[PDB]
């Protein structure tokens, strides 16, 4: 897998940006995919240099490759709720060595549009597990100390814009969005 | 664009396939590339150039294409294929990639199972937690201030979900039901 980074939290109207990390390859680009939907193709840059679009994302695309910095990058402007999705990056190789189609994908980032404020979560013990409650955006991620027995269940999202989920063991929360660490 | 049927279905053991049409300028002139994608996960490359495996890719998968038609045919199929497929190609007329709408791919003989619930009381504030899991099929009922999660399917293909109760801590016994297939259990 590529390494994908960047903010996971856009205000509309504003610029979403993301870079993935590759050594190599012939073609690099982007897709996404909005929850609950399908892949929807961004753009691809060639090794020729040679650049292509979806052309519904008018003027509003920018991708870039820095081969000798080992990265790749896109640029969305003006965004509105509508590019609210995970984004991936992929990388062409195609017959390498011995490797044959080879194709890595970033592990994807999901990107929410939106003017409301990043809100870090409130951790509470469940008694086992714990309850992970009213933050926003997405994701948080959970671990123990223990991999066995671990259920995290999806996110509510409550009358009050805000998420929770709980995480059970039959705990170290993350929320990146906030810089969140308990 | 690219046309996929919404929905197939295979049994444990036998075979399924899954269509992709498109037109001259796309599948016609150009390889076609398949994709197995789990949710919560990027799509993996099954299929590259009409009929070729990526390494590590098992040869149960395997592809073909016919004029303007491609297909991905699936053997000795496993409770964990299920997932979304994908096929994508290079749009000579258009300049661009397209995709197909994706093949959400179940598994048959799935036996049905009764929820395993768990009610957490509150620990400022009140929140009552009830945790349902590990249930097929993937629908169930739980019984001011409750919020309830639509079913997911869970990593091994059943289902969950989660209700939340909140409530004043002078508001705060207190039940969750969960109905599944008729049956009803309590936690308090
Ligand atoms: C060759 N891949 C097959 C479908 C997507 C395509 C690809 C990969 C990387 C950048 N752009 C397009």
């Given at each position: 897998q590529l390494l994908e980074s960047g903010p996971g939290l856009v205000k509309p109207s504003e610029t979403l940006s993301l870079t993935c990390t590759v050594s190599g390859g012939s073609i690099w680009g982007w897709i996404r995919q909005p929850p609950g939907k399908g892949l929807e193709w961004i753009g691809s840059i060639y090794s020729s240099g040679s650049t292509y679009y979806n052309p519904s994302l008018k003027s509003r695309v920018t991708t870039?490759?820095?081969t000798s910095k080992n990265q790749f990058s896109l640029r969305l402007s003006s965004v509105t709720a509508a590019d609210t999705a995970v984004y991936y990056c992929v990388a062409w190789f195609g017959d390498l060595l011995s490797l044959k189609g080879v194709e890595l994908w970033g592990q994807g980032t999901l990107v929410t549009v939106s003017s409301a404020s990043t809100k870090?979560?409130?951790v509470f013990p469940l008694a086992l597990?714990?309850?992970?409650?009213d933050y926003f955006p997405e994701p948080?991620?959970?671990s123990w100390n223990?991999?066995?027995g671990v259920h995290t269940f999806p996110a509510?999202?409550?009358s009050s814009g805000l998420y929770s989920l709980s995480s059970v063991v039959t705990c170290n929360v993350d929320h990146k969005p906030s810089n969140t660490k308990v | 664009e690219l046309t996929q049927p919404p929905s197939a279905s295979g049994t444990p053991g036998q075979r399924v396939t899954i269509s992709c049409s498109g037109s001259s300028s796309n599948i016609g002139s150009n390889y076609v590339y398949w994709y197995q994608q789990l949710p919560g996960t990027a799509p993996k490359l099954l299929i590259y150039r009409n009929n070729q495996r990526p390494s590590g890719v098992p040869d149960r998968f395997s592809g073909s294409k016919s004029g303007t038609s491609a297909s991905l045919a699936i053997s000795g199929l496993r409770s964990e294929d299920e997932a979304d497929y994908y096929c994508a190609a290079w749009d000579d007329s258009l300049?661009?990639?397209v995709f197909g709408g994706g093949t959400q791919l179940d598994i048959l003989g799935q036996p049905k199972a009764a929820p395993s619930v768990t009610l957490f009381p509150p620990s400022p504030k009140a929140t009552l937690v009830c945790l349902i899991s590990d249930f097929y099929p993937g629908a169930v009922t739980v019984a001011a201030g409750v919020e309830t999660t639509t079913p997911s399917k869970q990593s091994n293909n059943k289902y969950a979900a989660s209700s939340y109760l909140s409530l004043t801590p002078?508001?705060?016994?207190?039940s969750c039901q969960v109905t599944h297939e008729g049956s009803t259990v309590e936690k308090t």
């Open positions: 870039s490759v820095d870090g979560p409130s597990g714990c309850l992970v409650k948080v991620t959970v223990l991999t066995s509510v999202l409550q | 300049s661009a990639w002078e508001q705060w016994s207190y």
